[PDB]
Design a protein around this ligand. Sequence first.
Ligand SMILES: [K+]
Ligand SMILES: [K+]
Ligand SMILES: [K+]
Ligand SMILES: [K+]
Ligand SMILES: [K+]
Ligand SMILES: [K+]
Ligand SMILES: [K+]
Ligand SMILES: [K+]
Ligand SMILES: [Mg+2]
Lengths: 500, 500
Amino acid sequence: RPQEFAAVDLGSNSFHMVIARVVDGAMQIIGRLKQRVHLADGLDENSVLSEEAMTRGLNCLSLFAERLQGFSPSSVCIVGTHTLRQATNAAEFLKRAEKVIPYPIEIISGNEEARLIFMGVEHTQPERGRKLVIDIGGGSTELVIGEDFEPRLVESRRMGCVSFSQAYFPGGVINKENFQRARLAAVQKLETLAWQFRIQGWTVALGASGTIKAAQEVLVAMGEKDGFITPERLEMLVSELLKHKNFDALSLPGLSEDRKAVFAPGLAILCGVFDALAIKELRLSDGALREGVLYEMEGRFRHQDIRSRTAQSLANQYNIDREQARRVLETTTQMLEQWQEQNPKLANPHLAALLKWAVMLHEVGLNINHSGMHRHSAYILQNSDLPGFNQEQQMLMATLVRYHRKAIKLDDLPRFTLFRKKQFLPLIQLLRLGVLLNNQRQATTTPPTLRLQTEAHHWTLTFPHNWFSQNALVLLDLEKEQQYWEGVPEWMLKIAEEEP
Amino acid sequence: RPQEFAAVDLGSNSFHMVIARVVDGAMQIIGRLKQRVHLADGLDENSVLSEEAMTRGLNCLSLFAERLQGFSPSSVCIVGTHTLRQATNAAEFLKRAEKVIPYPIEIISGNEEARLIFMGVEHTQPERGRKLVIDIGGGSTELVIGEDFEPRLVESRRMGCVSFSQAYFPGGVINKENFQRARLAAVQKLETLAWQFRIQGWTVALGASGTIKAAQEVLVAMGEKDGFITPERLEMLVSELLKHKNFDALSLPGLSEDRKAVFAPGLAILCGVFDALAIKELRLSDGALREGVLYEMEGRFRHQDIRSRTAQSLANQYNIDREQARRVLETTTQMLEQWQEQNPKLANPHLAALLKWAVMLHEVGLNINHSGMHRHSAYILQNSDLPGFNQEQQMLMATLVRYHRKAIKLDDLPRFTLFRKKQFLPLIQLLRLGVLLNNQRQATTTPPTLRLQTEAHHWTLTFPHNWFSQNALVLLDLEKEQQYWEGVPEWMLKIAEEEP
Ligand SMILES: [K+]
Ligand SMILES: [K+]
Ligand SMILES: [K+]
Ligand SMILES: [K+]
Ligand SMILES: [K+]
Ligand SMILES: [K+]
Ligand SMILES: [K+]
Ligand SMILES: [K+]
Ligand SMILES: [Mg+2]
């Protein structure tokens, strides 16, 4: 039986339990239970947790305990974060919980919390290199810069969307002076770290938790479909926010009812983080504290390049013929480099990387069926949980694979928020030809030279002199592909041989 | 690297190559090449194969050879059938074939051909009992009775759709006298076996190859949706055929152009087989000679109940938690037996078995994602190649799994030729409840008693007295399921506890 374990996050807004089993190097989620306990809402001005909040929390823990019956304590990790760190009657809550759930609650430090969030990012997110990770919680904010599974700068500050609500927006009143007071308070807590962080720098800035997730959802709902948080987009958010007089009137697109009461103080802190660190683009990370517990503390997953780790896992799960993947990769890369030289304005290194991963993974669907494999592979790639690829990157890979066989219908293409069609359409063409030219698998006869010439979507592939006199089946398959391209307006595939 | 091999069938109508690898007890096709060589059309009245037909065959073999470059001879099995048995210059074709493909062609006897067709049926088809297997080819017809991977009676007769075309439909003329002569000629060839076969008997009659496939496709196109071939439906086929004067003029719904010129002689043989053996119902098998070569001669797959063999393969490929399947099976079965005793008219043992297999396989999609698992499992079950399940049975299993979580939309139900909605809808209700009551996996608390009362689609589940005092999470999930049933017209789920 595969190893199973549970990560339990007793946070400021929700109590959240995840149960997973480890199979072939993949973290397979097998259960998830969450309730919006709103524990942070129960902290009064003296940091005493109300009876009402403790009662909601204990009721949630009793449900978790029912689901964890029989689990070894070695397979359960329950962490309490800033709300339980901050509550002066935290011992009372733990006393009650001991009678309800038979696993100890580990109240972790802000340093430990920041490290766990970073580790969840490192185990799951696409971007490699130095990264800035921001998490604005209910009563604490964590900021980390690190790389290669190693935090370098680790900071936590006592500010969050709930604790700033009453302090700076008493009675839930929204005006520019309340907002600016909250925003300047956040900058002041970041004063002593701001330049240290800017000087370390980062390849990407990533955010986690409700406040940042809410900001991303409001922007997307307001038409900014890519979801990146930028200073200009924050300015628009603040302007729409300040058109409301109270939390009760808040009617922003994409703002959930759960987030209405904390969106203004959260947005103030987010603006202060941007002012302090001069962030230009912040992207929401879907991996955070719970993934740090699962991947690092419990699963002990390998510290290696995440996309490669995920690809190795998929090769085991899906019996990937590695020699087939490799010969397709070599052919596709040889043509890609010629296409790139001839079309430097279309060349995109991030898209080129995804084309190569799509080559590695294009046969994952072969265990379902040879018939329609391109669809079955795309189904797996689109719907799986793949560390190292966000949803757009997954959708792009799945799209390249989906289109690598049979009739090409460009009207069925997904809409991408970032990727431009002019830049990934030639990648479909390259994948189709690279797979085709290796479709005899280990029987493939690899041409010693292969020249690609492009004029818009008219492509000429030239093979050695007299090549096809020995490779009639390749030519039949290429002639079929020519008919497929003939079916795409403006496309044309020409096949040629070198002169003697 | 997994075991890999090629099965090559040099038949009367087409030359067909299949290449497959064996992974986790699954036959995974990875290559297929076929050409309609029409080798039997080159046999003259003296059974001499024309050089023109030989050249069509040599061209095809040269393409197969290109795809087989480097294959070990032990990994390639090429079989020749009646056309090469009957040809007086078969040795000439074999000598020429040495120039274009470096693997020997084994010309097999009619009895070995019959046994391989039977073994292909045994390894792939859902019907488990003693079976009659009929294969009407271009110049030979095979008839086998056997069970449990063991032929009991094996026979081949020199009659086929191509050989009977010239002999009884000279010039391609269609009239009742030509047809009757061919039909009686078929009966005459069967006189020496008919009594012996009748005495052995059969649970089911299965047919394979083009003639029988064409008959089924014409019946379906004419409105006989289940595609089963009966004496009454054959009489309709003859009456329609005899309204046409020649092969060129012949036009029937569902008859392809490739089959138009051999449909009348093939149908006459089929009618003669139905007469000689008193067949009342014949179903088309999609497994035959090539599957016998692949599954028996090359793969050497286990002689066991095919559905169980397939399920054990899927359990390995898809990491099925067997204890979870077991507890869901026990719960679903306890409720199924109560529903059956209360609805004996709706009870159906075939559908009941498909429910139990759906239980065993409902988590095959969990490796793709916990999120949407019911859709992912259905995707795998619907699109895989599953020995022991025909297309309709596969779609029924996939449909049960697809509907076992989340909103219930009966208007998206697939239409089945055989299975009636009123009979499988309660199977959806049973699987949903059986999975739900075990959704805490090994932490499940199994009620000592569980009573199901059905009044049409108004179901009452009664749990032990005060049961939910310690199973609050089960009650929450049942209350959600009650909301799901509220969304289906005339459905209602009631939850109760026994009196003290
Ligand atoms: K339980
Ligand atoms: K936080
Ligand atoms: K602080
Ligand atoms: K930035
Ligand atoms: K080759
Ligand atoms: K070769
Ligand atoms: K019968
Ligand atoms: K239990
Ligand atoms: Mg991902």
